[PDB]
Amino acid sequence: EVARVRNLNRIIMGKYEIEPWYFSPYPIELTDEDFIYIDDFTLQYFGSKKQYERYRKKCTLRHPPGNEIYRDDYVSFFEIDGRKQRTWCRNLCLLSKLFLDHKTLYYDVDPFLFYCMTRRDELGHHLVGYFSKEKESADGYNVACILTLPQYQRMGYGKLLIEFSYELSKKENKVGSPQKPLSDLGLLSYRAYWSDTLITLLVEHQKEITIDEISSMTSMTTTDILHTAKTLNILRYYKGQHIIFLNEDILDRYNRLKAKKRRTIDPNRLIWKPPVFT
Amino acid sequence: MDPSLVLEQTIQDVSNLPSEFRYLLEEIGSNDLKLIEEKKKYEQKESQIHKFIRQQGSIPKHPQEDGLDKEIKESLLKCQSLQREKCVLANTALFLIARHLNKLEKNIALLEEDGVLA
Amino acid sequence: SYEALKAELKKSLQDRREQEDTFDNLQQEIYDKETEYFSSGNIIKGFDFNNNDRIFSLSSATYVKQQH
Amino acid sequence: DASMTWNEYDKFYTGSFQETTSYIKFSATVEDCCGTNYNMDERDETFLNEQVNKGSSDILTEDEFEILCSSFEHAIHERQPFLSMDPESILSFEELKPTLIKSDMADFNLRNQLNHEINSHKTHFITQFDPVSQMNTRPLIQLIEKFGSKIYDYWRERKIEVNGYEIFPQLKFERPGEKEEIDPYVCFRRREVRHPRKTRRIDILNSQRLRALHQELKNAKDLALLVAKRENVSLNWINDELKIFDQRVKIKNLKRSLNISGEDDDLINHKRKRP
């Protein structure tokens, strides 16, 4: 009942004021405040402007508390273990819950890995979005929860998050799919990514390619590939096996896609090996 | 008290330490290289002042003494700034390892208080 | 006033002399300790030799000049 | 929603983060990079300005104020973990004072030991995790004598107002005693692993690996200390060069004023055998 309504009024994270969408189990005392301050580096919450000032004067953290595993001239990625960075990841989950309806903070942050995308500045790395990942997922999900902060939305950051999630799966020699209850906005973004990567792969390959060969090059599960082909009306059934072809539409879609000149993830700048858990 | 647990926890705690040591030490080297190039910048200007004193003494003023003294003081000042950074960096590496070492020594002491560890 | 400045400068030139001597010792001691301790688990390798693995000595650009 | 901009942002976010050529290697926690865990609110600063520093010859700084309160918070949690059972029975300053003296906040004893080992014995052991503003603050033991009792009286009342809980708003954690209330504000429950023990032989083998790992940390700590010493004496050297430079200019000016000749040997550097 209480969780089904917006918990907080307005939040000032860094220089950007954001308006929360859903309930988040912040300290209930903060619900009586007009403004809540969120540190741009530690994601710590504040109801008192004086406590915020004192905190900023003593805080030396200027990036996510973890190793930088990716960096280009646009964004960087940090890998953070929930078990190692309890305080920071709790703050991230509390912040993310404001914009994820079904995010659960029932248990602690230990069983999750947090891949956080930041943009660098004179002041440091500013978090723009992230996606979590189970350390050991039974269903093989490569993404648990994914979020682009509202102040950085509609800038293509959501696409970069999804790209990086598959670049991790490709480096893991595994196929992956986002956790199955996808939000309305989240589903819309994955369908757009799946179409764009499938259309680009088919056109550049220029030869018939098997479903298993597409799944091997993109780390997409066969389920997502088949579903993406059905939407594009390029899937057919012959002799008990699925076949993907090319038509005028795909070649036309590839042209409009390439003209967009979107930022992309450079796999050569990803210095990362999969963590080993005993 | 479980020695296998203590060993597992210690390795997990110290897993990222060798990466941090290399990262900190190569930043110290990067700054020490900047320090050497800045040392030559003032030692050459200081050699000009000293060359003058050897021939004529400290009583005659070097034709560019007032200009060189300001430039040497400036270069000597930014050398102090670079050197402070290396001290800070060196302190972090020492702090990280000492803090990991103290936690391990506490565990070893707790294991010795029982018959678990000899 | 002239005598005071000259006498406290000989002491500071002496301290600079002392700091340079202990600096040279530390440089050598660092190099020797690298040899003793690193020649299973290592701060160099990962806790789980080579002259280029002397990450402590390579932190000094004076040591880099010597080796090159 | 997030179009809006904050105007006081440039006041709260100052400084510069310098990018490094190689990727960042970091694992310190938020607690490591925040400093003193206590932060004054608007009520604390009016008390410090109007009741403590109004006519005082000795000024208590905001930073020093937080040092005292953080020690009070740490001591009470140790001695009275169940303070909420009877908030008005909170210990007095004199009763808590012995615990305050022995308190080791933010690895003070470790930092003090490292400061001693480096041969610095000057300033404080400062890392990448420490802010420059903390330089001015006095030691805790000195603060306990001058301002300990007066500040504790104020902090005692705030602790009573919150019924023995925390002054800063806290997350609601689950309690073992209470049945679940289906409370959406309860979060971050923990569930232990509960793994079976290894065989005794593996315990002995791992006990040997623990001793070997202990030796390697000692070896790395020795190298880390030597590098800290090398940079410490290099800091002493450049501080001498600055002082020597100003002592050479002043002598030359006075020497020219009196027109004295010779004695130039201290005014020029002399080459000597250097490895």
Ligand SMILES: CC(=O)SCCNC(=O)CCNC(=O)[C@H](O)C(C)(C)COP(=O)(O)OP(=O)(O)OC[C@H]1O[C@@H](n2cnc3c(N)ncnc32)[C@H](O)[C@@H]1OP(=O)(O)O
């Ligand atoms: C695992 C699951 O539960 S999914 C949960 C997903 N996360 C959320 O819903 C939290 C709130 N939303 C967000 O954080 C972000 O919007 C994300 C993560 C969904 C995507 O981030 P964005 O940066 O906004 O997406 P991005 O700008 O990269 O664009 C990707 C696509 O989403 C579409 N899109 C993004 N926002 C909108 C919108 N408000 N309305 C319509 N379409 C949108 C874009 O049109 C784009 O498709 P296109 O190529 O055809 O133009």
